[PDB]
Write a structure and sequence with these properties.
Organism (chain C): Clostridium botulinum
Subunit structure (chain C): Forms a highly interlocked heterodimer with botulinum neurotoxin type A at pH 6.0 but not at pH 7.5, called the minimally functional progenitor toxin complex (M-PTC) (BoNT/A, botA).
Radius of gyration of chain B: 38 Å
Order of helices and strands of chain A: EEEEEEEEEEEEEEHEEEEEEEEEEEE
Structural class of chain B: alpha+beta
Oligomer: part of a larger assembly
Shape of chain A: elongated
Family (chain C): Belongs to the botulism non-toxic nonhemagglutinin family.
Bound molecules: magnesium ion, zinc ion
Number of helices of chain B: 22
Distance between the termini of chain A: 30 Å
Radius of gyration of chain A: 24 Å
Helix content of chain B: 25-40%
Distance between the termini of chain B: 66 Å
Chains: A mainly beta (348), B alpha+beta (1276), E mainly beta (114)
Protein name (chain C): Non-toxic nonhemagglutinin type A
Function (chain C): Assembles with botulinum neurotoxin type A (BoNT/A) and protects it against pH-mediated inactivation or protease activity at pH 2.6 (the pH of the animal gastrointestinal tract) but not at pH 6.0. Necessary for neurotoxicity.
Structural class of chain A: mainly beta
Largest sheet of chain A: 10 strands, antiparallel
Largest interface: A-B, 63 and 55 residues
């Protein structure tokens, strides 16, 4: 009967948030959800006003429900057209950093508002006059801030997220600059907490409806087709042959366990006329069948360095796509394909 | 499923189908030659080329030597039938190796179905074959059959190693450039290969071999096959498109001839030397050529000269060119399909991608010119395999590309004289009277300076933004998954038939396609210079082999004017030490000091925190190549910090980015939709403009700047090699000066010293590669990109003004939306598109840097013992032999954990490869493993040393032994001089981190300084081993308790590793944290935390307390009670009682599998054992106070109380956390303790959730599960 | 130089002062000793003679 | 270092053409800069200790 | 829409010279190759010359050394200078812009008379 929001830095950080802000699990911990209309949260600290010589770092996990594209304030310490602000704009973010003399840094980061989690990192280094901006594991901006002098702003940082309902997790502010290694280390550590994720890097759930995509054919969904009066799975090679995308639901051996984890034994269900279950044929090729008892239990895992993709195996033989055949690329259980063919992803 | 479906021998009788004498097109009359059809449209003629070109019917050398770096001539080569059989089998083997790979399979398939076009008919309504695309095959009955084909492989011309694609041309058609295509004849020899120098791979392979590396012939064949594939589809780039170079400066080369076709064929960074403008130009040109072919097929009405139907030929060419056939049968070229085909033939068919597929070492660029020629023999399977090449698997040749090293795999490569003699093409550089001192500098040792006209652009040409203005897609870098995407949609089914064609004439008449007349670039051009050049500094470090003692000298002058003087950029103290006469008794210590100083100076790195994009600086680069100017190395460091990377360049490159072409917007009256679409298209084309200028700057950087840095890097490698060779020469003179008696008493192996200097140079080159790469990237980021960004911002300002005027002009049309469009324009154009290097260059992804570090650690392991499938094997590339004893016990839960008892049958033997056994005096090496040593109980273990790991041979080698609280490492040379290092842990301690717990042991051995022993990643002890001589380890490593007098003694051990280098503290810490299995919780001893297992409890804040239960029920509680007490055996052990207090049992709640292993974030129940019976840990979350007192309840009485526990594993991974949660998924808090009056009760507290991980305040909720173990074994 | 008159000029001066003092007071250099690698303070010798 | 910075600051506030509100902003920024200088000095003392 | 308009064709005596020109409207023709083809009566339209935006030229066999193809990107025009004409050079000459479409001209007749 309570939602606890606080600061664990041990400093004099004062937090004031709207009473009705919800918490939903994100990557590692619960994340604040802002509805974008009346929910906001402010952090107060004498260090947040920045200045002329202080170096600092900002990093957080953001998942935006990017409906609109107008310039809206997301988060920043802005007062007398001075300081810094991250805005929502177009398909992504905009970093604005302006000083008391008028020198400005307006940088557009593209492709962030795809309703998927992203790890945003900003590092302002005054000793080296260097600005670093990272999204996920890529260094998206390296700039020289030799021209930016005094960004003395308010001692409050106001997370507003105007006009865009969004999720924010793990907001962390440091008084030192960040190196690219540190960004990669934080990203990859936080990412593997034994949980499997969907296309949006949200936790994979049992008994939920998804659509399956292969890493190589990221935009071609997995569909179903009949060959010898029993039904198999393949991708849509012949452009829109009207093979509609198949509906997938994972089932665990446990009545409980809403969420999928590493090394889990799962069975796959497909919403055809009846609930069709996944089985391995004699030619190592996957097929849909009628009876639950014959469904094969596969062990599900993922790669540490690919955040939104997962792997499936049966008796050590992993699941991938076959060669051109019909033209149809069959789902097969074989270990003689390239590594990139074994990564799959689910989209709700 | 082989590409060549028949075993071909040169003495096989002719049959006229696949083995027969043939005559191909020729200038006049040609003698028929025996040829073999190895695949459809693929013939091989094991004959020297004296017939394809009538001007080259002579195998003797040409009148003037070819202007190529490496050339070899032998008029007797490929004359005997044995040579021809060897040639045929080698070509067959190379074709099989290419076809085995995915990319090569696609390449050969595309070559086969790319039949040359039937464009020989003068009448547009007919299809006539071209004679020059066919051959005549003599049948046994004496008749000849004319047959069309695609590819012929023949031997080389006069120059044996000059491989190229030839094709017979046409009277008016340029078959290789009009989309038609012609039959391709490739000059190739599989009995010879090139030899090149490489230093980039030391970052991932620090054990790289020394000297030259040999190119895999399969790569060269694939290169020529890609040329043939470009020519067969008629998309070969015009051979007069040449990357012009400046040849006027003293540092610039006298001349270079490279074609745009060759750059396209290479791929990687070489293909990026071409700007995007000319690439689009080429694509559209060949697109319209394909459309020409489509229209020719459409207007066709009949076929001539064959029995095959017209429709069949139309279908064949439809599949060759991927033409789209409509409902009426008319052919057309789809832009999408042509994109796929052109991209596959040009950007995927590259030498770089074949290098990636073949897994062999090869030059990253064409500017890494070849340096030698080697005779080879690839036919025997013991020398070369279809799947591995020279790098034979499970051998010494598999690792570090040692199969391609001409010195390690020396029996496979025989050096031959380079007919391009020394300094054949050169420049004469003279220093003005410091008379003149002049040096000849080889042409290919000079600087590649691309001309400005190569980088043409229309950035200054404005565009007209229309509502129909097309927005372009991305330009995806050719990655392996895209290659797989094309591989999975590739059609390997259809192969064109070998149809019956009308017989041609007996002698096919035809000549090759005309080559442009190339001028021999000037040679021997003399330059008069006022300053010593980098070439002079590099030349001063060279010397000639002989008897005379060469002496080092810091005066470049004196070194240049004396053969017996060698310049060195080292300190003057080094010069004095090396040049001194050393006595015999002091020889070995002298050599050791010289090695130490060499490694110290070469590995010298100065970190800087003052400039942004550069973090390290190597100072000796200053005096090594006279980079910049001035006296000391401090000048180099200071000037590098002050000026930037520009000092490293030999010529300042022009980066000329003009005013960007403004957009002109067309006006649509009374039309809202098309006007807003025009605005949006203008903004999108602006984004495209940002990307275009960025790409142009990256191309200019790759061609003008990065090449200079690469040459500097190569010359640094050369300078280090020169210094090492000079020092070795002086040391070996000194050794040979002795009477042979002193030479008997001193065991000196100069090859060992050469090795040692080689890996010292490898480390120095790791540092140099990192530094010079950083310099090149810094110059791109700071000195060239900003000119762009300025021009781009000016373009944004102009576009903003033009747009705002456009919107205010259509103010009536955009009624109401004036504000929204104004805001869109202002906000989009007020920002900057940041330049991301990972977008345009494949090298600079951060994940690849992490991968490089991990690989560098991995590739140093000469032995890696791991349990895979059902056997314990060696995961190293050497793949040593493992003999497992009958009584070796593997843990059923974690089979990597090996138990060794004090029995003769409980033993593990590793038979090492002969190339990885230790026999040296200078080679550093390391070992690491996890060991669990049980507590000692008997006094017989007192003063009883027993070996567990043995690598001793005749009292020489190394051993790991154990004693009472002692882990002992013992090194011993062949002279029985031995050194021991020890880690001591006491058994007289309350709670021990080592007794019966998993311990990560690491021993590093620097042959010059010390042997160090680390425990759990922390340095523990060190002993000087510099006084040790030659050590000869054992051919096998023995894991067995040897000499242990305790009959019941055993050990546990896992993750053994033997490395060929000295690990530093950082690397050992990385290994310790890597091998921790951080995803799985651990018990107190270090094993896997398990379900349904009773564990006594420890609290890490107060280890002297144990969990006890005051009373069972909701009204009771559990608290920490002390003291634990002490268990002891006098003079042996005195420890705190670990089996005291209540027990916990972890129960599965939401487990998705059945393995009884508690992983991280597992939702579990917890039972409490009181009076040997289980209760449930639970609490009432609705009681007042954040601290919720925990209680042990009857299992049927829990009801709806808070019981769901989330487990957490924090780093071994001994630290365990337990977050309590009710049945609604809410947090109750972590389980620790809180003070109520006297008693510290077990409490779920949400205050722990408010604390950052690893903080001291989290040590109260950190727990240690202790199960009963036979290594501890006190009374439960 | 011209004496500081605008607030910008003072910001430039103060930033350079801070950066130079930062580089001076935090000057370290890693060296090899018989005990291993040590992070030596650069100015120590000039500080206490 | 702090005395030099404070002397220059006080001199500029005493006699210069900068606007009063600007001078106030400068005072605030200089206070934060002194905090940063103290942090750097602390780093230096930790370095000498180690 | 892109438009190609040729001009300069006429009848010409053996060994004479004739200049063909072609102007473009609707595209900048920067970084776009151009070409001149000819169609003889009853034969297929054949390539005569090609010129790239950088200025590189590529000729056919029967036409090399007698014809010269040039271009001006600024004036958006392609030229074909025919020197030492021979009776085989008679036919309809067409200009082509190797662009996003099959951009052809109307065609102008050249007749070599003797
Ligand atoms: Mg509730
Ligand atoms: Mg307390
Ligand atoms: Zn080539």
């Amino acid at each position: 009967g309570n939602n606890v929001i606080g600061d664990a830095s041990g400093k004099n950080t004062s937090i004031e948030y709207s009473k009705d802000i919800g918490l939903v699990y994100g990557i590692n911990s619960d994340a604040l959800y802002l509805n974008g209309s009346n929910q906001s949260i402010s952090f107060s600290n004498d260090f947040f006003e920045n200045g002329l010589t202080n170096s600092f770092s900002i990093y957080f996990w953001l998942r935006n429900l990017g409906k609109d594209t107008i310039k809206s304030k997301l988060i920043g310490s802005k007062e007398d057209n001075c300081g810094w602000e991250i805005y929502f704009q177009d398909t992504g973010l905009v970093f604005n950093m302006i000083d008391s003399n008028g020198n400005e840094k307006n940088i557009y980061l593209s492709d962030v508002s795809n309703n998927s989690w992203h790890y945003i990192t900003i590092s302002v280094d005054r000793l080296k006059e260097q600005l670093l901006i990272f999204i996920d594991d890529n260094l998206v901006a390296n700039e020289s801030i030799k021209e930016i002098l005094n960004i003395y702003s308010s001692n409050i940082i106001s997370l507003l997220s105007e006009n865009n309902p969004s999720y924010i997790e793990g907001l962390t502010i440091l008084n030192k600059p960040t190196t690219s290694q540190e960004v990669l280390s934080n990203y990859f550590e936080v990412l593997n907490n034994s949980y499997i994720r969907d296309s949006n890097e949200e936790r994979l759930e049992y008994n939920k409806t998804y659509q399956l995509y292969n890493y190589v054919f990221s935009d071609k969904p997995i569909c179903e087709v009949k060959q010898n009066n029993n039904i198999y799975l393949t991708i849509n090679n012949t452009n829109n042959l009207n093979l509609q995308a198949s509906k997938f639901k994972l089932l665990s051996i446990n009545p409980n366990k809403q969420y999928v984890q590493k090394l889990d034994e799962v069975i796959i269900s497909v919403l055809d006329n009846m609930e069709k279950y996944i089985d391995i044929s004699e030619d190592n090729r996957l097929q849909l069948i009628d009876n639950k008892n014959n469904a094969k239990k596969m062990i599900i895992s993922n790669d540490i360095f690919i955040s939104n993709c997962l792997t499936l195996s049966y008796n050590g033989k992993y699941i991938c796509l076959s060669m051109k055949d019909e033209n149809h690329n069959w789902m097969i259980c074989n270990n003689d394909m390239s590594k990139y063919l074994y990564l799959w992803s689910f989209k709700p | 499923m082989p590409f060549v479906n028949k075993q071909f021998n040169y003495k096989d009788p002719v049959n006229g189908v696949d083995i027969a004498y043939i005559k191909i097109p020729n200038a006049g009359q040609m003698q028929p030659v025996k040829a073999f059809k190895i695949h459809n449209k693929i013939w091989v003629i094991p004959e020297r080329d004296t017939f394809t070109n009538p001007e080259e019917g002579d195998l003797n050398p040409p009148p003037e030597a070819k202007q190529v770096p490496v050339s070899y001539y032998d008029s007797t080569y490929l004359s005997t039938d044995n040579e021809k059989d060897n040639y045929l089998k080698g070509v067959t083997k190379l074709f099989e190796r290419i076809y085995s790979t995915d990319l090569g399979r696609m390449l050969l398939t595309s070559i086969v179905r790319g039949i040359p076009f039937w464009g020989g008919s003068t009448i547009d309504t007919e299809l006539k074959v071209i004679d020059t695309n066919c051959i005549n095959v003599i049948q046994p009955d004496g008749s000849y059959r004319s047959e069309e084909l695609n590819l012929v492989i023949i031997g080389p011309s006069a120059d044996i190693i000059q491989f190229e694609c030839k094709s017979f041309g046409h009277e008016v058609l340029n078959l290789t450039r009009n989309g038609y295509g012609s039959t391709q004849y490739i000059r190739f020899s599989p009995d010879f290969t090139f030899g090149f120098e490489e230093s980039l791979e030391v970052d991932t392979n620090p054990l790289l071999g020394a000297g030259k590396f040999a190119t895999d012939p399969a790569v060269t064949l694939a290169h020529q096959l890609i040329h043939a594939g470009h020519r067969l589809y008629g998309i070969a780039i015009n051979p007069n498109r040449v990357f012009k170079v400046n040849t006027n400066a003293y540092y610039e080369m006298s001349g270079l001839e490279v074609s745009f076709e060759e750059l396209r064929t290479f791929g990687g960074h070489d293909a990026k030397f071409i700007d995007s403008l000319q690439e689009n130009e080429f694509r559209l040109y060949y697109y319209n050529k394909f459309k020409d072919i489509a229209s020719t097929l459409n207007k066709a009405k009949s076929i001539v000269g064959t029995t095959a139907s017209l429709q069949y030929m139309k279908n064949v060419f439809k599949e060759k060119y991927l033409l789209s056939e409509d409902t009426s049968g008319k052919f057309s070229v789809d832009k999408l399909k042509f994109d796929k085909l052109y991209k596959m033939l040009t950007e995927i068919y590259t030498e770089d991608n074949f290098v990636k597929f073949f897994k062999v070492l090869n030059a990253k660029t064409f500017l890494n010119f070849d340096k030698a020629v080697f005779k080879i023999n690839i036919v025997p399977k013991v020398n070369y395999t279809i799947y591995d090449g020279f790098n034979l698997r499970n051998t010494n040749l598999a690792a570090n590309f040692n199969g391609q090293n001409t010195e390690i795999n020396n029996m496979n490569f025989t050096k031959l004289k380079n007919f391009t003699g020394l300094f054949e093409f050169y420049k004469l550089l003279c220093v003005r009277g410091i008379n003149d001192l002049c040096i000849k500098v080889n042409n290919w040792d000079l600087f590649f300076s691309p001309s400005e006209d190569n980088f043409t652009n229309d950035l200054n040409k404005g565009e007209e933004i229309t509502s129909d203005t097309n927005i372009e897609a991305a330009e995806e870098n050719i990655s392996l998954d895209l290659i797989q995407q094309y591989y999975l949609t590739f059609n390997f089914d259809n192969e064109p038939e070998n149809i019956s064609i009308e017989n041609l004439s007996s002698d096919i008449i035809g000549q090759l396609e005309l080559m442009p007349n190339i001028e021999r670039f000037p040679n021997g051009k003399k330059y008069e210079l006022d300053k010593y050049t980098m070439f002079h500094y590099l030349r001063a470090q060279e010397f000639e082999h002989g008897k005379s003692r060469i002496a080092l000298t810091n005066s470049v002058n004196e070194a240049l004017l004396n053969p017996s003087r060698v310049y060195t950029f080292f300190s003057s103290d080094y010069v004095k030490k090396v040049n001194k006469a050393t006595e015999a008794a002091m020889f070995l210590g002298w050599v050791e000091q010289l090695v130490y100083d060499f490694t110290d100076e070469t590995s010298e790195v100065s970190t800087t925190d003052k400039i942004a994009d550069i973090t390290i600086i190597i100072p000796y680069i200053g005096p090594a190549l006279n980079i910049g100017n001035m006296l000391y190395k401090d000048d180099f460091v200071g000037a590098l910090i002050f000026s930037g990377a520009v000092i490293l360049l030999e010529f300042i490159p022009e980066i000329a980015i003009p005013v960007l072409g403004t957009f002109a917007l067309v006006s649509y009256i009374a039309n809202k939709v098309l006007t807003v679409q025009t605005i949006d298209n203008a903004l999108s084309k602006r984004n495209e403009k940002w990307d275009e200028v960025y790409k142009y700057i990256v191309t200019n950087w790759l061609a003008k700047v990065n090449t200079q840095i690469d040459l500097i890097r190569k010359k640094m490698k050369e300078a280090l090699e020169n210094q090492a060779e000079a020092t070795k020469a002086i040391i070996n003179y000194q050794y040979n000066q002795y009477t042979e008696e002193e030479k008997n008493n001193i065991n000196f192996n100069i090859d060992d010293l050469s090795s040692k200097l080689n890996e010292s140079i490898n480390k120095a080159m790791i540092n140099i590669n990192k530094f010079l790469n950083q310099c090149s990237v810094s110059y791109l980021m700071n000195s060239m990109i900003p000119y762009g960004v300025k021009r781009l911002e000016d373009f944004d300002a102009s576009l903003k003004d033009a747009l705002l005027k456009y919107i205010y002009d259509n103010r009536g049309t955009l009624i109401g939306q004036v504000d929204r469009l104004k805001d869109k324009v202002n906000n989009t154009l007020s920002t900057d598109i940041p330049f991301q290097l990972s977008k345009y260059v494949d090298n600079q992804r951060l994940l690849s840097t992490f991968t490089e570090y991990i690989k560098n650690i991995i590739n140093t392991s000469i032995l890696n013992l791991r349990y895979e499938s059902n056997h314990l094997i060696d995961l190293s590339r050497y793949a040593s032999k493992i003999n497992i004893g009958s009584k070796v016990n593997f843990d059923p839960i974690d089979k990597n954990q090996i138990q060794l008892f004090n029995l003769e049958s409980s033993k593990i033997e590793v038979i090492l490869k002969n190339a990885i056994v230790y026999n040296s005096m200078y080679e550093n090496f390391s070992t690491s493993f996890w060991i669990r040593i049980p507590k000692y109980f008997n006094s017989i273990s007192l003063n009883n040393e027993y070996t567990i790991i043995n690598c001793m041979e005749n009292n020489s080698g190394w051993k790991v032994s154990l004693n009472y609280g002692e882990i002992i490492w013992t090194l011993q040379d062949t002279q029985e001089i031995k050194q021991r290092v020890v880690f001591k842990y006491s058994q007289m301690i309350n709670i021990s981190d080592y007794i019966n717990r998993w311990i990560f042991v690491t021993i590093t051995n620097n042959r010059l300084n010390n042997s160090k022993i680390y425990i759990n990643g922390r340095l523990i002890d060190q002993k000087p081993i510099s006084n040790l001589g030659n050590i000869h380890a054992s051919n096998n490593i023995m894991f067995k308790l040897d000499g242990c007098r305790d009959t019941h003694r055993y050990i546990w051990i896992k993750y053994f590793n033997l490395f060929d280098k000295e690990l530093n503290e950082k690397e050992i810490k990385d290994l310790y944290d890597n091998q921790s299995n951080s995803g799985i919780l651990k018990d107190f001893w270090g094993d896997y935390l398990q379900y349904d297992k009773p564990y006594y409890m420890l609290n890490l804040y107060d280890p002297n307390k144990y969990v006890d239960v005051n009373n069972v029920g909701i009204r009771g509680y559990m608290y920490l009670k002390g003291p634990r007490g002490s268990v002891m055996t006098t003079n042996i052990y005195l420890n705190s009682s670990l089996y005291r207090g209540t027990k916990f049992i972890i129960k599965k709640y939401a487990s998705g599998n059945k393995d009884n292993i508690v992983r991280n974030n597992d939702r579990v129940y917890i039972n409490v054992v009181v009076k040997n019976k289980e209760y449930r840990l639970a609490t009432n979350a609705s009681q007042a106070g954040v601290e919720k007192i925990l209680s042990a309840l009857e299992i049927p009485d829990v009801g709806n109380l808070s019981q769901v526990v989330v487990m957490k594993s924090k780093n071994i991974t001994n630290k365990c956390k337990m977050n309590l949660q009710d049945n609604n998924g809410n947090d109750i808090g972590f389980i620790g303790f809180h003070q109520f009056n006297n008693i510290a009760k077990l409490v779920a507290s949400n205050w722990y959730n408010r604390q950052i991980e690893r903080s001291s305040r989290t040590l109260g909720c950190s727990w240690e599960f202790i199960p009963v173990d036979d290594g501890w074994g006190e009374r439960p | 130089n011209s004496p500081i008159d605008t607030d910008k000029k003072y910001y430039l001066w103060l930033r350079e002062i801070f950066r130079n003092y930062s580089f001076d007071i935090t000057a370290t250099q890693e060296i090899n000793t018989n005990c291993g690698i040590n992070k030596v303070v650069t100015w120590f010798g000039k500080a206490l003679n | 270092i702090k005395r030099i910075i404070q002397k220059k600051l006080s001199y500029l506030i005493g006699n210069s053409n900068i606007s009063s509100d600007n001078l106030a902003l400068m005072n605030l920024t200089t206070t934060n800069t002194l905090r940063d200088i103290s942090n750097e000095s602390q780093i230096a003392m930790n370095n000498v200790d180690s | 829409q892109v438009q190609l308009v040729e001009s300069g064709g006429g009848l010409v005596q053996v060994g004479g010279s004739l200049r063909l020109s072609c102007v473009v409207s609707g595209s900048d023709i920067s970084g776009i190759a151009m070409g001149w083809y000819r169609q003889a009566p009853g034969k297929r339209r054949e390539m005569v010359a090609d010129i790239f935006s950088g200025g590189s030229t590529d000729y056919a066999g029967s036409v090399k050394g007698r014809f010269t193809i040039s271009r001006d990107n600024a004036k958006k025009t392609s030229y074909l200078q025919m020197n030492n004409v021979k009776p085989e050079d008679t036919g309809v000459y067409y200009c082509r812009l190797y662009g996003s479409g099959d951009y052809w001209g109307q065609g102008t007749q050249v007749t070599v008379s003797s």
